[PDB]
Ligand binder design. Structure first.
Ligand code: ZN
Lengths: 112, 55, 115, 69, 96, 100, 68
RNA sequence: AGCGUGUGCCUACCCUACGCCGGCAGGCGCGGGUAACCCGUUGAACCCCAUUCGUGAUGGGGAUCGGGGAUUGCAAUUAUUC
RNA sequence: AGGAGUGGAGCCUGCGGCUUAAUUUGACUCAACACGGGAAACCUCACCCGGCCCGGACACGGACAGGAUUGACAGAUUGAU
């Protein structure tokens, strides 16, 4: 549930994945994101409002979880980020061949 | 009226009492282990839950 | 020629008795039709039908009542009363006799045609 | 002779309701009476017996190929 | 779409107490489980919610069976004007 | 005071490493310890047809869920148990404690 | 679009003109008179002016009938 | 015998040993299991042993049909099932 | 080279065809026919008979607090109270 929701929500700022860690009285969720500036919004607004969504929909005591996000390392290796970038570049007006060549050269230059 | 017709026919059993939690359909639902998910959606999202192919 | 007896008893003595002995008088499957509890879930229409049948008619064949149901049990308290049964499409007129006691209602329906 | 009633063939008949074991010609006569009663009732079982089809609720699309021609 | 006066103000108070709002996609479920202190029809409140969407005051999200609603600056202006309160009131999502 | 803690996880190496770490810590604390009891694994099999439609050769899928349940017995006071639970927490292990 | 079998109409509420004038009878002084009934129910007080029937009167929200 | 499964989210519906009523399904006051703890040593069937049956559509086949008694759900007719 | 067999007998099931107010449909040699996880008494349901509150947001021009609304008890077709 959480993975699908985060993939659909944080697609606008380069979503990669999530790693839910469970700890009594304090649940620490970490989000695999590529663009940390767009995921925080305006000084932590996004974290608080998505947390409120979490308690309101899932149902959980308030003030116990804390949504987290950090810049992912070696983003060229994660295929999900490249697929999302290709979706962005093919969305508006880019040619299929040129865009595919660009993503291919970036992937093979990433170290794969 | 229709407000009385909402909770009129018993939605206790049969097949309309339950539905898939992904697409709100009522075919191929897996009630095993309380999945309540149809076969296609379970096949689609099986690896994320943890069920993976070893045999 | 030979006066019928319902399964041991005759019409008047059968009528002058309640369900608490009627149930043992007839068979088992229709006993559960009233043994689980009072019938009020979808039997408001059935009770309305009973009231309509017990309404005093003129000295002739009584009036006809149209219903969308085919799930009534034939009790003696409505024999000799005309009812319109919604046999899928039309409220077909039916004819009953005092030998109908203890049976179902919607068994007088022809599926398509004799062929 | 202390024989329980459930062991008998037909019990609590529609005619008299008494419990009696019936013999060959008696069974044939009672079957005729029951089928005539169903015919007079014009019940579903009686009419399906009249055309001579399966009355318990079976299928005919693939069953009953040795009857009418 | 006839809406009693008390239900609308109750839903406005429930929405403004935080920055977001949720509801399940099931019209055959009158009582709202989170708002257990009132017999609000969930179908009416979600339909008024999406009508407020159609007038364009909030963002809409929906994944499998639960909708997600998020406030906006113009949306919070509309809410504060309907509630007849000064703009000094802030939701729980804007505080540190 | 016969404390019995139950550990359930899907991965086997992580569970074995966590149990070994707990045993080493208890031994360094110089406390009586029991043997790590390994309950029989429970397999969850959900076999479904692979065809979204109903056309083609009848193929099938085989899904498995190998779960494990390792547990140890201790005769320690609960304060050290709470101190241990306050450290070395990972998502793989869902600790369940039974007091006896 | 149109159908084959004709359909009836939907019920409409006629314009209620001078409702208050129909509730209280005007006298030649400050005194007032009433020609309707008052609801003795616990949920609703005497503010619910029942309809002016001729056989038996009907309440507003109670769905109850008081006979003569 | 060996794989399984088991008290629920809108969801009540689980496996049930134990002692009775009755040929029989079936009916209540009685307990555990959220499971290597309880059903459960899962006393399975096919096997094995001693009569009955004796080439006879016959002690195989149970196709068709009537009546009676039962749990299920608001509801069993074209019998849900036994 | 062999074993079990099917096809012949009875019974359950899908398809085609005839019938039916309706008997919904997808797939037609391997690679369609106990296949859609579909063993359909009500929901299933997507077909016929019938009548229901509408589950027509919102923008514009009219209709309105001097009432635009909205829920109905005796009784009649109706299916219900
Ligand atoms: Zn009143």
């Amino acid at each position: 549930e959480l993975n699908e929701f985060l993939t659909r929500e944080l697609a606008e700022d380069g979503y990669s994945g999530v790693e839910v860690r469970v700890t009594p009285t304090r649940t620490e969720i970490i989000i695999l994101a590529t663009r940390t500036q767009n995921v925080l919004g305006e000084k932590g607004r996004r974290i608080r409002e998505l947390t409120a969504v979490v308690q309101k929909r899932f149902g959980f005591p308030e003030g116990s979880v804390e949504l987290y996000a950090e810049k992912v390392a070696t983003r060229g290796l994660c295929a999900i980020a490249q697929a999302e970038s290709l979706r962005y570049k093919l969305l508006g007006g880019l040619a299929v061949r040129r865009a595919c060549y660009g993503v291919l050269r970036f992937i093979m230059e990433s170290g794969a | 009226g229709h407000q009385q017709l909402y909770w009129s026919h018993p939605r206790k059993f049969g097949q309309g009492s339950r539905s898939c939690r992904v697409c709100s359909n009522r075919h191929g639902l897996i009630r095993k282990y309380g999945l309540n998910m149809c076969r296609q959606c379970f096949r689609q999202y099986a690896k994320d839950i943890g069920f993976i192919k070893l045999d | 020629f030979r006066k019928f007896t319902y399964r041991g008893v005759d019409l008047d003595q059968l009528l002058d008795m309640s369900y608490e002995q009627l149930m043992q008088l007839y068979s088992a499957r229709q006993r559960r039709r009233l043994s689980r509890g009072l019938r009020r879930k979808q039997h408001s229409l059935l009770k309305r039908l009973r009231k309509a049948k017990k309404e005093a008619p003129p000295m002739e064949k009584p009036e006809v009542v149209k219903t969308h149901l085919r799930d009534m049990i034939i009790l003696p308290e409505m024999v000799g009363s005309m009812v319109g049964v919604y046999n899928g499409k039309t409220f077909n007129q039916v004819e009953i006799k005092p030998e109908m006691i203890g049976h179902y209602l919607g068994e007088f329906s022809i599926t398509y045609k004799p062929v | 002779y202390k024989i329980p009633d459930w062991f008998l063939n037909r019990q609590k008949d529609v005619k008299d309701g008494k419990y009696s074991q019936v013999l060959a010609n008696g069974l044939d006569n009672k079957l005729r009476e029951d089928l005539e009663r169903l015919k007079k009732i014009r019940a579903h079982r009686g009419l399906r017996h009249f055309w001579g089809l399966r009355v318990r609720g079976q299928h005919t699309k693939t069953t009953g190929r040795r009857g009418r021609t | 779409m006839l809406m009693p006066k008390k239900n609308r103000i109750a839903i406005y108070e429930l929405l403004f107490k935080e920055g977001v709002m949720v509801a399940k996609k099931d019209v055959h479920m009158p009582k709202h489980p989170e708002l257990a202190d009132k017999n609000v029809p969930n179908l009416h409140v979600m339909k008024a919610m999406q009508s407020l969407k159609s007038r364009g005051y909030v963002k809409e999200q929906f994944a499998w069976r639960h909708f997600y609603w998020y406030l906006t600056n113009e949306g919070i202006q509309y809410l504060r004007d309907y509630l007849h309160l000064p703009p000094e009131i802030v939701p729980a999502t804007l505080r540190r | 005071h016969r404390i019995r803690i139950t550990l359930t996880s899907r991965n086997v190496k992580s569970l074995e490493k966590v149990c070994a770490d707990l045993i080493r810590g208890a031994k360094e604390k110089n406390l009586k310890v029991k043997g790590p009891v390994r309950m029989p694994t429970k397999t969850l099999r959900i076999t479904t047809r692979k065809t979204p439609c109903g056309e083609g050769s009848k193929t099938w899928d085989r899904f498995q869920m190998r779960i494990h349940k390792r547990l140890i017995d201790l005769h320690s006071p609960s304060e050290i148990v709470k101190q241990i639970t306050s450290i070395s927490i990972e998502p793989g292990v869902e600790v369940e404690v039974t007091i006896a | 679009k149109s159908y084959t079998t004709p359909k009836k109409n939907k019920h409409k509420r006629k314009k209620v003109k001078l409702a208050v004038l129909k509730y209280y009878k005007v006298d030649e002084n400050g005194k007032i008179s009433r020609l309707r009934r008052e609801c003795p129910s616990d949920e609703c007080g005497a503010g619910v002016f029942m309809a002016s029937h001729f056989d038996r009167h009907y309440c507003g929200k109670c769905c109850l009938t008081y006979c003569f």
